[PDB]
Each structure stands twice: as C-alpha cells, then as structure tokens.
Ligand binder design. Sequence first.
Ligand SMILES: N[C@@H](Cc1ccccc1)C(=O)N[C@@H](Cc1ccc(O)cc1)C(=O)O
Ligand SMILES: N[C@@H](Cc1ccccc1)C(=O)N[C@@H](Cc1ccc(O)cc1)C(=O)O
Lengths: 81, 81
Amino acid sequence: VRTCLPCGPGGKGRCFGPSICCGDELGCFVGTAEALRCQEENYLPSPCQSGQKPCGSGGRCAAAGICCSPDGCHEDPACDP
Amino acid sequence: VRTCLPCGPGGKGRCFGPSICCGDELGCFVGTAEALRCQEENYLPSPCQSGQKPCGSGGRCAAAGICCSPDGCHEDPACDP
Ligand SMILES: N[C@@H](Cc1ccccc1)C(=O)N[C@@H](Cc1ccc(O)cc1)C(=O)O
Ligand SMILES: N[C@@H](Cc1ccccc1)C(=O)N[C@@H](Cc1ccc(O)cc1)C(=O)O
C-alpha cells in the first residue's frame, strides 16, 4: 500500500503512526510538532504503511537502529544499517 | 535521585535515555539531533532519573500520553495529562 504522509524537517520524514514521524537521516519524532501532520492520516480512508523491514510486534524499521509501530518506537539492532 | 541532563528546544526537555529527549511542551525526540546531548549522561558517575510517574515496563511518563524507558517510548493513557 502507499507510504504514509511525509512529515518533519524538509518533509524528509514519513509517518509511522498518528504521532510518530521518522526518517533515516532524522531519527524519530514521537508526539512532537514534527509529527502533528501524522494525525491527518486518520482522516484518509486508504491504508498506508511506512518503512521496509518488519521488526518487533507490528512495527517496522523507521530509522537507524529504531523500530516503530503506530503507537511507539524502541531501539532495535535488527534495524541498524 | 538527580534529574538527567537537559536537552532539546530551549533546553526545555530532559534526557530519558542516551538518545531520547522529552519535555511536557515538546513531546519526545528519539534518535534525533535534539537527543545527541543525552549521550553525555553515560559518562556521569551519578545515577539520574527523569519524569515522576512509573509506567509500562521500567518506563516513566515523559510527555503527555507518552511513556519512555531508556530504550524507547510508547503511547500510554496512564501518562495522559
Ligand atoms: N489512513 C489511515 C486509516 C486507515 C487504516 C486502515 C485502512 C484504511 C484507512 C491509516 O492508514 N492508518 C495506518 C496507521 C497510521 C500510520 C501513519 C499515521 O500518520 C497514522 C496512522 C494503518 O492503520 O495502517
Ligand atoms: N549517569 C548514567 C550512568 C549511571 C547509571 C547508574 C549509576 C551511575 C551512573 C545514568 O544515570 N544513566 C541512566 C540512563 C540514562 C538516562 C539519560 C541519558 O541521557 C542516558 C542514560 C540510568 O542508568 O539510570
């Protein structure tokens, strides 16, 4: 399905959840201003998914060494470059 | 227990982990530039702690509706304002 809405500095990030914005060259913003646009995805009737590698439980590698699901992120070696 | 080092915009955040910086009016920065300063804590001989309310597994409320441990953060109603 489509990648979720872009977000963050220079739009270089992508939403991984309502309040989670991440990018390989940015790290992850959780609940910060950078992730506010990510709540808008809730209004879009089509499914979206960001990232490429599955990790944790229902999560995906969102940034260097970081795994995120729609409600949280945690450091994960499997997600390291 | 001393509070961990300050970090983030206007120094309004506090470190919850080597690469996690959170603040009540900021949200949480996970692996972003804002959290680089938090690596210094690793070399301070005294233990530190941020937040006042325990949550999830070994985490503490770091921001409105967010629970963080030194390894990550997740949405948690128990942390709502
Ligand atoms: N567009 C939303 C809602 C939706 C979910 C499933 C099917 C159709 C619509 C969406 O895709 N939400 C994601 C989760 C998510 C991801 C990013 C974000 O900024 C907010 C939520 C999903 O459930 O797959
Ligand atoms: N000061 C560090 C290391 C230390 C731990 C225990 C006793 C003495 C020193 C520290 O307190 N680390 C925290 C975790 C942490 C928090 C913020 C941060 O920027 C980096 C690490 C701990 O282990 O409690």
